[PDB]
Amino acid sequence: NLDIIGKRIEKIKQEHETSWHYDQDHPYKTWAYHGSYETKQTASSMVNGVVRLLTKPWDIIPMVTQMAMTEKVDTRTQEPKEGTKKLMKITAEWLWKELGKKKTPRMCTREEFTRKVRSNAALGAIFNKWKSAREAVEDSGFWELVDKERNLHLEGKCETCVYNMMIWYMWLGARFLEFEALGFLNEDHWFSRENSLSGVEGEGLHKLGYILRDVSKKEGGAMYADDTAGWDTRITLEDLKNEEMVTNHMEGEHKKLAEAIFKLTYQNKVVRVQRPTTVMDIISRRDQRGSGQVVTYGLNTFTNMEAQLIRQMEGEGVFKSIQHLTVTEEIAVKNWLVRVGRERLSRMAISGDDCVVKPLDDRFASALTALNDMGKVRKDIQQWEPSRGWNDWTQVPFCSHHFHELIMKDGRVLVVPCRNQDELIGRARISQGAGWSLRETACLGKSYAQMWSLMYFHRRDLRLAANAICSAVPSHWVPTSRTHEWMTTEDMLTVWNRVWIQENPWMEDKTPVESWEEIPYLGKREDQWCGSLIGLTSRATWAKNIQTAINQVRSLIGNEEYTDYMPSMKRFRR
Ligand SMILES: Cc1cn[nH]c1-c1ccncc1
Ligand SMILES: Cc1cn[nH]c1-c1ccncc1
Ligand SMILES: Cc1cn[nH]c1-c1ccncc1
Ligand SMILES: [Cl-]
Ligand SMILES: [Zn+2]
Ligand SMILES: [Zn+2]
Structure with missing residues (x-):
């Protein structure tokens, strides 16, 4: 709690000292609330006239024309059982080692970040002191602020790494420090199909069909494509701790800088939210996903690969119950991963929260205890109803x-x-x-x-x-x-x-x-x-x-x- 987040909270209070108050009519049940302060402000979808003038028949099709017009975040996930926590820790340890065999973790550079802003990537910054990202990156004063926070992170503390809700925008500085520590996951293609076997990062929409047809060629059961209901809101603190184990593969400054992003911004968060009753609420919580969208993609892919290997283990009878792994079930789980883990990854196509799994057989369809207990509850099916699979790769979403x-x-x-x-x-x-x-x-x-x-x-x-x-x-x-x-x-x-x-x-x-x-x-x-x-x-x-x-x-x-x-x-x- 407040020893890790207080400084960020303390700093915000003093910028709005003329407006602070513990509002007693705050809607938050699962977020910890801290205070409010006066603001006033919010961009809707605009029509492209060139495309619309050349697609006239669609001017009378409501499914086209309605697209241009126009209490999941405030829920909590239960802590998994001891057997589930063990399965996740063993699998996560094994998966970081496989992903790391042919890659080297490394810091991403000011230069790399500067080149990104200068050809328009969606880094999720904010408008203040400079107008745009292009201006801030070109100004030596920005990097001085970056330097202050950076030395604060090496010291194991945080002052200015605060989320703004709407997508969780941070100031360009906090985005840089995230990219410096964890940008390597995307920049060096840790989730390419060659490197991760389940991943499709960088493959291209023209390859995804061929990849699903290759999965269809394996002997096994139906193809399963279960969507999770609100994946980002079901990321548990146990998930965030298994993700942080990537730092065990790092050294020097990088190890410390990455440990600080996980500890201070991911496993503890500070967020500003607009409430029309128009105040700004300063709330905190420990769990759920709130990273930049590109780090969010890689860690979602990682935790999704882990969750699906455990659901495959469940269908194959590798462990009996999630209540508790026996000493020898642990050895069986480890041994499954070593002898068939790579083959079982190749049975999957995983893009962040989205998966397709061709398991060894259809016992997978009713292997639900670990998946439900990890909090990855399936969308649009009753909790204990067996998954409906697809018989033809050309039908799979x-x-x-x-x-x-x-x-x-x-x-x-x-x-x-x-x-x-x-x-x-x-x-x-x-x-x-x-x-x-x-x-x-x-x-x-x-x-x-x-x-x-x-x-x-x-x-x-x-x-x-x-x-x-x-x-x-x-x-x-x-x-x-x-x-x-x-x-x-x-x-x-x-x-x-x-x-x-x-x-x-x-x-x-x-x-x-x-x-x-x-x-x-x-x-x-x-x-x-x-x-x-x-x-x-x-x-x-x-x-x-x-x-x-x-x-x-x-x-x-x-x-x-x-x-x-x-x-x-x-x-x-x-
Ligand atoms: C540092 C720099 C300057 N011009 N291009 C690069 C570059 C491009 C791709 N990967 C690494 C470096
Ligand atoms: C997440 C997302 C959305 N549209 N495209 C992607 C993507 C692109 C390349 N590699 C991985 C993912
Ligand atoms: C279009 C989309 C949505 N989610 N992921 C992708 C994707 C993944 C890999 N390569 C290209 C695109
Ligand atoms: Cl089908
Ligand atoms: Zn910080
Ligand atoms: Zn079609």
Whole structure:
């Protein structure tokens, strides 16, 4: 409690001494409350006009148009039983060693951090003293503040590492110290599939289907894809202590700096929350996930890999009960990990809180005691109801997608990502933040269009809309995003060949594709099942009259150099 968090709390009181009070009508039951102080302030989703003018048939589809319009944090998780705590400690110890065999923990640098801010990563900072991250990083006074907190952390204390709720934004300084100590997990790809066997970090949406098809090839039971209800709110203090064991692999300054991030900011937290009754509440708690989103991704992947290996151990009968491991169950658990752990990791695809598991057999479906007792309660099923698995890898949900096997005219086999097309069009019609020029709006539309050409070329409506947007935006204008092989001014046919043929390890024949007409679509009925408007009168008029829509947008942007991409399609090619 207050010996670790007091200084942060003490400091905040004194900046708002004219406003402090122990408000007696505070809604917090599971968060420890400290005080309140006067403030006044809050950005909604804005429509991208370039994408909307080129997707007119979707203007009357509520699932698209509603996407642009518009008491889980205040719960507590019970402490796991002694048997569960032992399983988690043994598995976590083993997993950090496997992940560390071919990697070396190391500090990330001011230089590395500076380069990140200078090409727009979502580091979750705040606006004050400087306007933006770019300005703060370029100012020697910032680094002096960073230095003060840094020496405080080496001394085992904290003053300014406080979360702001809304996503848990910190000041750029606290973000740096997090990245210095734990950035290596992402920067050096600890959760790549090569390094972690279950992980998919850095793999790309064009590989995830092939990875699930490789898991499907293993002998075993159904494929399980159980979602957890509010994963970040079910991270226990036992979880945070197993995660901290990465520091056992560190040395020198780095070990001390990383131990301080875990001890002072993760296992103890201070948060400011807006309450319209508009005060700022200063609350603390020990458990749940509140890191930067990139460290959150890696530690979620780690704890998810651990949880799923334990659920596999439960299905395989490695231990009888979570109440208590006997001396010899401990040796059996250790021995399972050493002899088959790596094989059992290869049976999984894990992206943070999202997993797919192909267990040895279907005993897994009813192996629920460790999973429930670890607090990883499944979403949308009763606590003790057996999991429903998937019999076909092409039906399994993963990372908001499903995956199709698509046969090219020349016999070669693509495995492609897919999701309901209303979700894809709805997302592309939305921009975030203020002060967007027409050029910037056009360049964001072009980013969506090029992603569609690379990932969703097999959807008739998206290949046509992608071609239309690329025809409507000046040819040399560079795709942008405010938070990815489609981010380029290279010819997208050249990029398609590099991604799906040349660099694709599942494609043995490397014969390049000469034109977009060689690149196939889903079956027409499959395209409709996944939300295509092909067959509707609105869609036929849009396709036939597309040059008129392209010319509307070209007239708004003005007299620029444009290319016609529509004749890359059979139906427009004379
Ligand atoms: C330090 C620096 C400067 N220009 N590029 C790098 C760099 C890039 C990628 N990995 C490590 C270093
Ligand atoms: C977490 C997230 C969301 N969209 N994409 C990712 C991602 C990208 C690359 N490697 C791992 C994850
Ligand atoms: C799109 C998404 C969501 N969660 N994770 C991913 C992902 C993972 C790995 N590579 C690319 C993307
Ligand atoms: Cl199925
Ligand atoms: Zn601190
Ligand atoms: Zn589909």
